[PDB]
């Protein structure tokens, strides 16, 4: 019998990802030429459309660590808040990644 459990779109069906797992996902985005960004919010449900941006997108540092740093900086300051990583394609002007990295 399935349990009832709030979920969080992409990757929320997997066990939580390790900082090393997060950095691999970020590395994929950098290697595709996408622009990673960090965002967080106090809740998540179906009706919420926007989260809040953490600082700004980092536009092309070549290394996944500076982005990870941001995740963990956000995680330590805002530990009651959901956090996720987003990646933008600037060519097609579309979002191509949005994954839950931390849940309270």
């Amino acid at each position: 019998t399935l349990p009832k459990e709030r979920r969080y779109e992409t990757f929320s069906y997997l066990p939580p990802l390790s900082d090393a797992q997060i950095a691999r996902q970020i590395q994929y985005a950098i290697d595709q030429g996408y622009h990673p960004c960090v965002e967080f919010n106090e809740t998540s449900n179906a009706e919420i459309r926007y989260w809040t941006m953490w600082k700004l997108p980092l536009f092309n540092c070549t290394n996944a660590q500076d982005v990870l740093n941001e995740v963990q900086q956000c995680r330590s300051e805002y530990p009651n808040c959901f956090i996720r990583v987003v990646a933008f394609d600037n060519i097609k002007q579309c979002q191509v990644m949005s994954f839950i990295v931390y849940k309270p």
Binding site: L2, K4, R7, F11, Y13, V86, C94, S98
Partner: protein, 428 residues
């Protein structure tokens, strides 16, 4: 007169590529001219300048191997066609020519729609990018289940099935193309209990859910009434059988969907009546272009499972023609002409028919993110079956993003995930 191999087509011309099988003893050049003539002009004659209204064959390409077959390329002037009318485009090109007696068989393989004609069409009411933004779903294919049995569930039982599927982690469930409104299940009752199912699944999971509610109907009035009631219930998506209903109805519904923020899922019932035989009919890729122009946000493109590498390449060809802005000519994939879509939005590919969890890695690898994977039994039922497919999908996407090779490591990826997901394990 109708065969002019020196003509070079204008960027505003509509081009057609016909596979032609002439009757025994008809030479290629007469059949080609006949194809051009019978699909266009065919005392008042000298009141008009017939030159500027004719189609012409500008190239005849013999087919190595094939018996008595060749490709005739036809050019039609922009002015022949009614603006914004797929109906008129089809009537003009394919209305007549397939019954010509000098041809034993005729198949339309491709069409080059010029930018200047495309700008007269709305196109998809939303398109890939807008639809992900409305649904909030990024970086993965979407997932759907068809409800079974096709026919026979009461509206309420039908909604129960929908709720269990959606609450398991599928984005969408789907009406069967046969279900419109029938004695065993009236459409208004179905719309209402499906909306209850969606509301409960969406509140339990915190993810936006939808169900392609079928509005195909006997008249335009009754189609629009079923649409409006979906809108009234705040449903995000509906469904239409474009070929059995028709392009006139479909174009109407596509404009209503743009006007009302509704997503439109298009089912392709009846397509094999025309598109299946190699010698005669209309290739699906033409039906697909027409559909993009009239408008849809999703369209069934068939499965890739258990098909030869050459059928696969053809499917991938028309999937690009549905999704991309610019598709380069490429015969090895059945693309006869370079097609510029001029920013008309792309349509999500819907893969369905005989798919299971163990196909997941290949499906992600083949279609990439912009696809709906439509499944449709797990040992523990609907919600567990849904969680299995959802974990499997998320496992493959994580793996891909990690640089793992989904074609070689597929089973492994699935086996790893099965280790911490009982639902996925039970599905192996």
């Amino acid at each position: 007169t109708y065969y002019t191999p020196d003509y070079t087509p204008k960027d505003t011309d509509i081009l057609a590529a016909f596979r032609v099988t002439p009757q025994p003893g008809v030479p290629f050049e007469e059949a080609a001219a006949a194809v051009a003539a019978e699909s266009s002009t065919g005392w008042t004659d000298l009141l008009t300048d017939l030159d500027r209204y004719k189609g012409c064959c500008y190239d005849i390409e013999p087919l190595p191997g094939e018996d008595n077959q060749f490709i005739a390329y036809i050019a039609y002037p922009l002015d022949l066609f009614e603006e914004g009318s797929v109906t008129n485009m089809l009537t003009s090109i394919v209305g007549n020519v397939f019954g010509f007696k000098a041809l034993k068989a005729l198949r339309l393989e491709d069409l080059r729609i010029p930018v200047a004609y495309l700008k007269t069409f709305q196109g998809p009411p939303h398109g890939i990018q807008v639809e992900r933004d409305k649904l909030n779903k990024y970086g993965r294919p979407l997932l759907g289940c068809t409800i079974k049995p096709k026919l026979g569930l009461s509206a309420k039982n039908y909604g129960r099935a929908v709720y269990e599927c959606l609450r398991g982690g599928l984005d969408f469930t789907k009406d069967d193309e046969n279900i419109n409104s029938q004695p065993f299940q009236r459409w208004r009752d179905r719309f209402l209990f499906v909306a209850d199912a969606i509301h409960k699944a969406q509140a339990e999971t915190g993810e936006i859910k939808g169900h392609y509610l079928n509005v195909t109907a006997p008249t335009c009035e009754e189609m629009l009434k079923r649409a409006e009631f979906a809108k009234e219930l705040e449903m995000p998506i509906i469904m239409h059988d474009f070929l059995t209903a028709g392009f006139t109805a479909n174009t109407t519904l596509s404009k209503w969907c743009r006007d009302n923020g509704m997503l439109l899922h298009i089912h392709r019932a009846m397509h094999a009546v025309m598109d299946r035989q190699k010698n005669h009919g209309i290739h699906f890729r033409v039906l697909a272009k027409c559909l993009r122009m009239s408008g849809g946000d999703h369209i069934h493109t068939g499965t890739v499972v258990g098909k030869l590498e050459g059928d696969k390449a053809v499917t991938l060809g028309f999937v690009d023609l549905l999704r991309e802005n610019y598709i380069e000519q490429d015969r090895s994939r059945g693309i006869y002409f370079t097609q510029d879509w001029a920013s008309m939005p792309g349509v999500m590919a819907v893969a369905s028919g005989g798919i299971h969890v163990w196909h997941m890695p290949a499906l992600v690898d083949i279609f990439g993110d912009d696809a709906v994977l439509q499944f449709g039994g797990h040992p523990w039922g609907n919600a567990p079956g849904a969680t299995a497919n959802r974990v499997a999908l998320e496992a493959c996407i994580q793996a891909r993003n990690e640089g793992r090779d989904l074609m070689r490591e597929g089973g492994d990826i699935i086996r790893e995930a099965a280790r911490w997901s009982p639902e996925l394990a039970a599905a192996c």
